[PDB]
Amino acid sequence: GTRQKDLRERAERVIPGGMYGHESTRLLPPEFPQFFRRALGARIWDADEQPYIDYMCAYGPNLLGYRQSEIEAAADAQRLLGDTMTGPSEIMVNLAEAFVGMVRHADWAMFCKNGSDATSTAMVLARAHTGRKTILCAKGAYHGASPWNTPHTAGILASDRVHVAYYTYNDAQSLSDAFKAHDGDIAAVFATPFRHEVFEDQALAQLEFARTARKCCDETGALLVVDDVRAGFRVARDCSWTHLGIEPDLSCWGKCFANGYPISALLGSNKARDAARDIFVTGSFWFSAVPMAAAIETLRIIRETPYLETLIASGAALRAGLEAQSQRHGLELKQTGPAQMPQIFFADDPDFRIGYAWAAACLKGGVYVHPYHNMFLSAAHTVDDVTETLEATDRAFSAVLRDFASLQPHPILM
Amino acid sequence: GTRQKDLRERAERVIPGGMYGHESTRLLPPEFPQFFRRALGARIWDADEQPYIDYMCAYGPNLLGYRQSEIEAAADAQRLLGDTMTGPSEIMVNLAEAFVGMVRHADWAMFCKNGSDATSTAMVLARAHTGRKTILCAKGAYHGASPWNTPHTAGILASDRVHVAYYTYNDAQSLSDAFKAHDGDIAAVFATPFRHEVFEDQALAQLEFARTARKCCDETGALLVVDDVRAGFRVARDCSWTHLGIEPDLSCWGKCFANGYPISALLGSNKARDAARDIFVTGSFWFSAVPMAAAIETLRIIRETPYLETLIASGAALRAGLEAQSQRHGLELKQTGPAQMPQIFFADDPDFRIGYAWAAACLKGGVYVHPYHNMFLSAAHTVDDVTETLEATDRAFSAVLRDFASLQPHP
Ligand SMILES: Cc1ncc(COP(=O)(O)O)c(CN)c1O
Ligand SMILES: Cc1ncc(COP(=O)(O)O)c(CN)c1O
Ligand SMILES: [Mg+2]
């Protein structure tokens, strides 16, 4: 609309490319809005005041609803006291106690801003702890956008990641072999708790893979690092490997544990405490109290309320509804990963032209779904939201069938 | 006091060493409180409700006073709309226009969280722009706590910084020599706008040094990056090298441009725009609107009010007062760098025993000063605050003289 077009014209002049990073719409159909005006519960409004039921949950942070009144009350109370001060607030202690108490593997916490801050801290910690160099990551796994791990390597030197080595996710043989390929020199294994990457089907972690990670780390003294920045608190009320009976040495957390306030965390066992004290990591904003107050109230709600069961039920209902609509319209889906963090692709759609068209058509019905990145459910998504969503998705399936002969892949994608 | 001691005991159990990073009190005298309860204007209150006139300004962020009412009203207005959303707020555009408008060398802005995010982005951008490897930094200059730049190297590999090379700050010949030592391979020169580092006297940047940096960059196509995360908006209303007449290609900003709200920025000229589009930098929280709304209002106040002149006047008064006071007591100071971001050391105090004792004695008088790290003035510090500060500093000078024979360095 008129406001979006003005904003895009202006943005291109003063922001490289008009926008950047994971929230850029550059690889989405052109009808996706870039700039928003407001948000509440499970909904966002674009600059032209069109509402969307939001299945990105702000790319993860919106766990409980935008402007959730209890979290905003806790943030308000802390803001009357102080935020970014010469030292941390006393409540930093309360937050570390609360987080450590919830995470069975952890005896301590460190707070930072970005999830990338937490994964980088984990990497440096493991090198200090072991005196070894090699960090093992799954090929194509996203752990942040630092030089060591950013997925797109313009301006990145080989030397920035020369001591990162790779294994195939969910392949126990591949991981075992990676330990032996750098025999005696493994500082850490990083693993996301499931496979959650762009343009790729999701897949749950396999027990044998997770056991092999834990066993090889135990045998060698390497630290097991679960990167829970994305899945944290939508799989479980603890580390997302809890249900596999596999406890890491370090876990990284972010996005949603203050329901949108900027704070991330490294949780660590006592095994790793000395190395955590030896490294030097910090930032201007890492000791700010208002995000910590929001985190304390979010963690309370996580502990004390059926938020998790609620958002999973909404996810499951959406999944079932799309399966049924899929069969009716003759357009097979691949719905993968947990229903509460779903990847929803079309079968037999290798250039994504079908998925792109369908996602764009859902916008016209007031639904924001994503053709290449996993989605997310919030505890604020209602049974009514899901019913209304499925009316939009029905029409989107019809629009894709109607326009099927004229569909084109995204040019920049191509 | 009692609450501080309970908190340190509890902290030790659930946080490595009870605290970490630049706000840890580990290297300060033991009477420095680690944990605080509240903050307002130029004052902080510790966990035992003792007020201090605060000369750290939260280590830079507090430019206009804690809980500054206009910035909080602007933050409130945005919070009723939305903060961390599926895309940025429309106000991201307003913020970029405002920041670009204020910064003469800049045509575009990118926003992030940490100052370290901005400096890292500048590094990657320069390598993408030039296709070269070597980043030149001043020996001992702090640009963040990433693997490539962190000052303490536990867990850091040689390979993390093998393409960072060093020059001597304020030494034009050293910088020129460093270009030639990596001939045709310089991606960027990073410089803080003055020397501002721990345990060291500060020094203003020399014109010939800055001109050399600009000229060597111009000749080689390397990018000149001014790291203004610390000094930004306390030296000038533009890049802190504005008074030298030297414009960088990139400048890095953070700490105070949203008066405590967490947001940082890379500002760049069109020369660097293509490379800025080519690199991939992002974060979950980098597109949040409320820090951007605080930033817009902070930047307006910076442009439209005499905040700079106010904090400079306060810094100048404090410096002249301490000069006179120290001389009366026969204890010479080294007050270095800008008066509004002062380093206050004692002459002939190589193990900091005197400065530590003095700084500790200031706490008893309700004044928070730092014996090894530069301090900061805010526009909320008043003439009466300086007068009251000087009463406490006087007593601290007397305390140091009384206990002089017994002073011991920090363990
Ligand atoms: C000049 C300079 N540059 C970069 C940084 C990094 O900022 P942050 O701590 O917010 O990551 C700092 C922080 N002291 C700084 O002083
Ligand atoms: C699993 C995972 N780890 C780390 C990060 C990095 O977090 P941030 O973008 O907040 O720096 C992300 C962000 N997508 C993530 O999904
Ligand atoms: Mg625990």
Curated annotation (Swiss-Prot), chain B:
Keywords: Cytoplasm, Pyridoxal phosphate, Transferase
GO molecular function: pyridoxal phosphate binding; transaminase activity
Pfam families: Aminotran_3
Residues bearing the modification N6-(pyridoxal phosphate)lysine: 255
Entry EC no(s): 2.6.1.-
Domain of life: Bacteria
pH dependence: Optimum pH is 8.5.
Entry's localization field: Cytoplasm
Temperature dependence: Optimum temperature is 35 degrees Celsius.
InterPro entries hit by this protein: Aminotrans_3, Aminotrans_3_PPA_site, PyrdxlP-dep_Trfase, PyrdxlP-dep_Trfase_major, PyrdxlP-dep_Trfase_small
Reaction(s) this enzyme catalyzes, per UniProt: (2S,3S,5R,10R,12S,14S,15R,16R)-2-amino-12,16-dimethylicosane-3,5,10,14,15-pentol + pyruvate = (3S,5R,10R,12S,14S,15R,16R)-3,5,10,14,15-pentahydroxy-12,16-dimethylicosan-2-one + L-alanine
PROSITE patterns named in the record: AA_TRANSFER_CLASS_3
Main location class: cytoplasm
Named cofactor requirement(s): pyridoxal 5'-phosphate
Entry annotated with the keyword Transferase: yes
GO cellular component: cytoplasm
Family note: Belongs to the class-III pyridoxal-phosphate-dependent aminotransferase family.
Role: Involved in degradation of fumonisin B1. Catalyzes the deamination of aminopentol (HFB1) to 2-keto-HFB1. Pyruvate is the preferred cosubstrate, but it can also use several other alpha-keto acids as amino group acceptors.
Name assigned to this protein: Aminopentol aminotransferase
Source organism (scientific name): Sphingopyxis macrogoltabida (Sphingomonas macrogoltabidus)
